Design an enzyme around this catalytic site. Structure first.
Site, PDB file in Angstrom:
ATOM      1  N   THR A   1       0.927  -1.428  -0.047  1.00 30.46           N
ATOM      2  CA  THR A   1       0.024  -0.145  -0.162  1.00 30.46           C
ATOM      3  C   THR A   1       0.768   1.068   0.204  1.00 30.46           C
ATOM      4  O   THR A   1       0.871   2.022  -0.683  1.00 30.46           O
ATOM      5  CB  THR A   1      -0.923   0.513   1.419  1.00 30.46           C
ATOM      6  OG1 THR A   1      -1.822  -0.652   1.002  1.00 30.46           O
ATOM      7  CG2 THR A   1      -1.570   1.156   1.895  1.00 30.46           C
TER       8      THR A   1
ATOM      9  N   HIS B   1      16.022   0.014 -20.246  1.00 26.36           N
ATOM     10  CA  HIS B   1      15.856   0.634 -21.941  1.00 26.36           C
ATOM     11  C   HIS B   1      17.468   0.160 -21.819  1.00 26.36           C
ATOM     12  O   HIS B   1      17.678  -0.853 -20.846  1.00 26.36           O
ATOM     13  CB  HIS B   1      16.366   1.995 -21.244  1.00 26.36           C
ATOM     14  CG  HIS B   1      15.415   2.996 -20.257  1.00 26.36           C
ATOM     15  ND1 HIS B   1      14.631   3.502 -20.889  1.00 26.36           N
ATOM     16  CD2 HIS B   1      15.257   2.964 -19.083  1.00 26.36           C
ATOM     17  CE1 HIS B   1      14.154   4.290 -20.482  1.00 26.36           C
ATOM     18  NE2 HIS B   1      14.147   3.923 -19.662  1.00 26.36           N
TER      19      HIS B   1
HETATM   20  C1  LIG Z   1      10.880   6.276 -15.128  1.00 25.36           C
HETATM   21  O1  LIG Z   1      10.435   7.410 -15.265  1.00 25.36           O
HETATM   22  C2  LIG Z   1      11.457   7.998 -14.760  1.00 25.36           C
HETATM   23  C3  LIG Z   1      11.626   8.901 -15.407  1.00 25.36           C
HETATM   24  O2  LIG Z   1      11.112   8.980 -16.966  1.00 25.36           O
HETATM   25  C4  LIG Z   1      13.524   7.257 -16.014  1.00 25.36           C
HETATM   26  O3  LIG Z   1      14.280   7.765 -14.922  1.00 25.36           O
HETATM   27  C5  LIG Z   1      15.303   8.143 -15.712  1.00 25.36           C
HETATM   28  O4  LIG Z   1      15.793   7.845 -15.809  1.00 25.36           O
HETATM   29  C6  LIG Z   1      17.267   8.185 -16.848  1.00 25.36           C
HETATM   30  C7  LIG Z   1      17.541   6.949 -16.799  1.00 25.36           C
HETATM   31  O5  LIG Z   1      18.404   6.047 -16.286  1.00 25.36           O
HETATM   32  C8  LIG Z   1      18.295   8.960 -16.105  1.00 25.36           C
HETATM   33  O6  LIG Z   1      19.056  10.120 -16.314  1.00 25.36           O
HETATM   34  C9  LIG Z   1      16.629   9.820 -15.364  1.00 25.36           C
HETATM   35  O7  LIG Z   1      17.408  10.938 -14.043  1.00 25.36           O
HETATM   36  C10 LIG Z   1      16.207   9.244 -14.158  1.00 25.36           C
HETATM   37  N1  LIG Z   1      14.911  10.629 -13.586  1.00 25.36           N
HETATM   38  C11 LIG Z   1      14.459  10.097 -12.453  1.00 25.36           C
HETATM   39  C12 LIG Z   1      13.492  10.347 -12.201  1.00 25.36           C
HETATM   40  O8  LIG Z   1      15.083   9.130 -11.621  1.00 25.36           O
HETATM   41  C13 LIG Z   1      13.550   6.278 -15.637  1.00 25.36           C
HETATM   42  O9  LIG Z   1      14.412   5.002 -16.366  1.00 25.36           O
HETATM   43  C14 LIG Z   1      11.750   5.385 -16.073  1.00 25.36           C
HETATM   44  N2  LIG Z   1      11.745   4.097 -16.264  1.00 25.36           N
HETATM   45  C15 LIG Z   1      11.614   2.742 -16.797  1.00 25.36           C
HETATM   46  C16 LIG Z   1      12.005   1.590 -17.198  1.00 25.36           C
HETATM   47  O10 LIG Z   1      11.815   2.947 -18.360  1.00 25.36           O
HETATM   48 CA   LIG Z   2      20.043   0.159 -20.409  1.00 24.63          CA
END
Ligand SMILES: *[C@@H]1O[C@H](CO)[C@@H](O[C@@H]2O[C@H](CO)[C@@H](O)[C@H](O)[C@H]2NC(C)=O)[C@H](O)[C@H]1NC(C)=O
Ligand SMILES: [Ca+2]
Ligand SMILES: *[C@@H]1O[C@H](CO)[C@@H](O[C@@H]2O[C@H](CO)[C@@H](O)[C@H](O)[C@H]2NC(C)=O)[C@H](O)[C@H]1NC(C)=O
Ligand SMILES: *[C@@H]1O[C@H](CO)[C@@H](O)[C@H](O)[C@H]1NC(C)=O
Ligand SMILES: *[C@@H]1O[C@H](CO)[C@@H](O)[C@H](O)[C@H]1NC(C)=O
Ligand SMILES: *[C@@H]1O[C@H](CO)[C@@H](O)[C@H](O)[C@H]1NC(C)=O
EC number: 3.1.4.1
Length: 765
Positions: free
Chosen positions: A146, A652
């Site tokens: 939760t 990614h």
């Molecule tokens: C989920 O959302 C966040 C924001 O779009 C993603 O996190 C970012 O990822 C990139 C690459 O690692 C970083 O440069 C950013 O600084 C991160 N931002 C934050 C707010 O944490 C995250 O990668 C996304 N998840 C997936 C699985 O795609």
């Molecule tokens: Ca990767």
């Protein structure tokens, strides 16, 4: 002649000299209406026969006085009781195609309400389900607890990204412990992401909160405009009264967004929240906001499926326990010597020592990168490498000593009397921003997925643009320059397709179009074959994607036969000499379609992918046995298979500099996973190549591991564990898209909102 408008007075004026002072009780002199007009009135939250038109009492909770509407302090039932108006609850369902908002209400307020714990019992919440919109079940993210799930709702982020990965955690970089009982719960460093209240605030609007995970925290150095510090002391009516006072605020100070959290005698309790809910609706009606405010209710219908009989103990697996264990349903194991030994701790040994220990074993240990990719539960220091996947209804503990909510929405921006299909709560944040007309901060939801919940969607989704155009790999010679140390003792012209032959395979094997390369400077080329079309990644010397439509079935693979692709440069292609632990596998199964010679189009260096001996076993079984079974079930199927490189487990695709392991002595990268997306049609009467309506999807992101320890195959034949493993690694199409940098179905004659719906559907098992 009674106590009406004479409460506590030296007046002897009454029936036969009855009194209305506080001493009348003990004298027996009270007028018959004394207790109701003077006493109980100061302690109830509702008007009645006695109170309508009363002289204002200072001690009173709410008012029933003639000037209460102008004074803004009426009880919610004032208009129905004192003015005989039909209450919201009895009144027919609202048809409002546009927000009928009062003056000053430029934009309709949003109230996000959460509850926990048929119809005749809860009439108000039922009216909402009745008139409004409701989702079957609202899919919660891992762990399905939760507290993290509430923060996910308001942030749009997975716990690994918003920071709240469990109710209990230890961050090594802070060298601090988080728990709900601790003062640390309030430390803003734990709270990553940007919650919906901040988004609205940062974008001009004002926001209030009457409890919600993290709303009593200065997340990014700021609290909501109005907030209350968590306490279960406050009665529901007082909470609802405050909520209405906030809406009675001047435009300037008045919030646009609201969060309100509420947590045999079960029905009695539920009825108390339904009454509080009905008070909120009545209050809104009395303000002319009942057809203005867009209200979302989340009712956690989750039940404790745990029993003291269904508990696994680590004592049964270890002679000695010197590790710390976060116990329960989503366990994590760490060193006790923190921070000093945090990164040195042999996490790999723990997973190994807990792997295939008992046949009945009600848990499965994993290192976080080996966990099913759909969960997105690895990229955070807070998430300990050792993770246990406990079976449903079971728990895991050191020694002897889950959210599932129903989504409900009512309001002028929402579709009326509609049942909507289950979705993940990560999606909700964009919906909140659309309802509020603000720009969502980077989140994990896909913008426009939930547009089907809206009468007039604020955001119109668009197909992602390709960042790399296909180039080269044309048929130049039917004889290859470099043999690539390849052998086939037993044709290349079958790789030379004419404009008409190309259009034929595109129609059949790329029915929803080709996947689009959403990767900057990714050198690729498409290869066209009668039975399949692959997207060849030049730098990795392997195909990123491969597409083929297996028709409904009514043949072994050609042995010791392999040759160089006459279209692909030797500088950009794999050699047979690279292999000899890890061996070449066929991304596209050669024997799946056509005759013995149709196989020659697949027996080339362009169809080779690096595979572990043990993975190839699973891979080949799926393509030789399971796939044909599915192709019968679905009346043909469009298969998209491909390598996935996610070494830093961030969900990614990896940049080249991120890939850490290659085929020994070569520059060919080892995929961390492999994906298989089964795209067939929902209406089984049509094959996938000829389908006008919706598509039925089945995506897998299966880990490319060197041993099958996960499946615990000990002597068992593939027919017992391979399918189980494939099903264990199901995931959304979007999960694939992220891990590959490809974009699917950009040529399916449906709106982008609808495809975004499909790209977020997770198959149920
Ligand atoms: C989920 O959302 C966040 C924001 O779009 C993603 O996190 C970012 O990822 C990139 C690459 O690692 C970083 O440069 C950013 O600084 C991160 N931002 C934050 C707010 O944490 C995250 O990668 C996304 N998840 C997936 C699985 O795609
Ligand atoms: Ca990767
Ligand atoms: C976080 O809590 C844990 C206990 O839950 C604390 O762990 C102790 O840490 C020291 C070294 O720092 C060890 O020698 C002990 O054996 C640990 N005890 C247990 C029961 O694990 C830890 O110190 C806490 N950290 C903070 C900063 O609060
Ligand atoms: C944090 O707040 C600042 C302004 O105070 C803003 O520029 C920044 O975008 C915010 N970041 C997040 C993710 O909340
Ligand atoms: C909440 O708690 C903090 C610290 O205890 C305090 O400074 C603040 O005024 C409180 N806010 C409200 C609105 O209760
Ligand atoms: C399935 O297709 C048949 C015709 O092929 C049609 O009668 C039926 O309505 C279709 N249903 C859906 C939901 O596609």
């Amino acid at each position: 002649g009674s106590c009406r408008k004479k409460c506590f007075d030296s007046s002897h004026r009454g029936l036969e000299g009855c009194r209305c002072d506080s001493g009348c009780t003990d004298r027996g002199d009270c007028c018959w209406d004394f207790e109701d007009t003077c006493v109980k009135s100061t302690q109830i939250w509702t008007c009645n026969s006695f109170r309508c038109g009363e002289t204002r009492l200072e001690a009173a909770l709410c008012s029933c006085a003639d000037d209460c509407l102008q004074r803004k302090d009426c009880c919610t039932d004032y208009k129905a009781v004192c003015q005989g108006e039909v209450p919201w609850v009895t009144e027919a369902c609202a048809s409002s195609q546009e927000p009928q908002c009062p003056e000053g209400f430029d934009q309709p307020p949003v109230i996000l309400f959460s509850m926990d714990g048929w119809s005749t019992l809860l009439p108000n919440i039922n009216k909402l389900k009745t008139c409004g919109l409701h989702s079957k079940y609202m899919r919660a993210v891992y762990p399905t607890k939760t507290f993290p799930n509430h923060y996910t709702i308001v942030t749009g982020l997975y716990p690994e990204s918003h920071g709240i990965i469990d109710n209990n955690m230890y961050d090594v970089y802070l060298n601090k412990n988080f728990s709900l009982s601790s003062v640390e719960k309030s430390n803003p460093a734990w709270w990553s992401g940007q919650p919906i209240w901040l988004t609205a605030m940062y974008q001009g609007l004002k926001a209030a909160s009457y409890y919600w995970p993290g709303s009593d925290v200065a997340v990014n150095g700021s609290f909501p405009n109005i907030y209350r510090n968590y306490s279960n002391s406050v009665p529901y009516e007082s909470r609802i009264a405050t909520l209405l006072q906030w809406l009675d605020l001047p435009k300037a100070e008045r919030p646009s967004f609201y969060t309100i959290y509420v947590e045999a005698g079960v029905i009695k309790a539920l009825q108390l929240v339904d009454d509080a809910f009905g008070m909120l609706m009545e209050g809104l009606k009395q303000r002319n906001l009942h057809n203005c405010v867009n209200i979302i209710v989340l009712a956690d219908h989750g039940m404790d499926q745990t029993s003291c009989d269904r508990v696994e103990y680590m004592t049964d697996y270890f002679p000695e326990i010197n590790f710390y264990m976060y116990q329960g349903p989503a366990p994590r194991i760490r060193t006790r010597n923190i921070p000093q030994d945090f990164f040195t701790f042999n996490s790999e040994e723990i997973v190994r020592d807990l792997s295939c220990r008992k046949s009945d074993q009600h848990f499965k240990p994993y290192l976080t990168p080996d966990l099913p990719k759909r969960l997105h539960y690895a990229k955070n220091v807070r998430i300990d490498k050792v993770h246990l996947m406990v079976d449903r209804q079971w728990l895991a503990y050191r020694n002897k000593g889950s959210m599932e909510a129903i989504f409900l929405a009512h309001g002028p921006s929402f579709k009326e009397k509609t049942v909507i299909e289950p979705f993940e709560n990560i999606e909700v944040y964009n919906l909140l921003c659309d309802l509020l007309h603000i720009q969502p901060a980077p989140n994990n939801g896909s913008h426009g997925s939930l547009n089907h919940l809206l009468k007039a969607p604020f955001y119109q989704p668009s197909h992602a643009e390709e960042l790399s155009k296909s180039a080269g790999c044309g048929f130049t010679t039917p004889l290859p320059k470099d043999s690539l140390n390849c052998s086939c003792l037993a044709v290349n012209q079958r790789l030379n397709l004419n404009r008409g032959e190309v259009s034929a395979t595109e129609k059949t094997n790329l029915p929803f179009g080709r996947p689009r390369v959403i990767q900057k400077n990714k050198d690729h080329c498409l290869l066209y074959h009668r039975e399949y079309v692959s997207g060849f990644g030049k730098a990795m010397k392997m195909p990123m994607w491969s597409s083929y439509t297996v028709p409904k079935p009514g043949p072994p693979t050609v042995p010791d036969c392999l040759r160089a692709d006459v279209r692909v440069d030797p500088s950009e292609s794999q050699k047979c000499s690279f292999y000899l632990n890890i061996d070449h596998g066929f991304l596209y199964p050669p024997a799946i379609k056509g005759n013995n010679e149709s196989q020659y189009d697949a027996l080339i260096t362009s169809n080779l992918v690096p595979m572990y001996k043990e993975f190839k076993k699973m891979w080949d079984y799926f393509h030789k046995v399971l796939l044909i079974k599915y192709a019968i079930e679905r009346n043909g199927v469009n298969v998209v298979s491909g390598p996935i490189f996610d070494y830093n487990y961030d969900g990614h695709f990896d940049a080249p500099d991120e890939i850490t392991n290659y085929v020994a002595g070569t520059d060919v990268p080892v995929p961390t996973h492999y994906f298989v997306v089964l795209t067939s049609c929902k209406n089984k009467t049509h094959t996938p190549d000829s389908c006008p309506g919706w598509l039925d999807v089945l995506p897998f992101v299966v880990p490319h591991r060197p041993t099958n320890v996960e499946s615990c195959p000990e002597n068992k034949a593939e027919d017992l564990w391979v399918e189980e493993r494939f099903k264990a690694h199901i995931a959304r199409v979007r999960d694939v898209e992220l891990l590959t940098g490809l974009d699917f179905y950009q040529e399916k004659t449906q709106p982008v909102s609808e495809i975004l719906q499909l790209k977020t559907y997770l198959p149920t098992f």
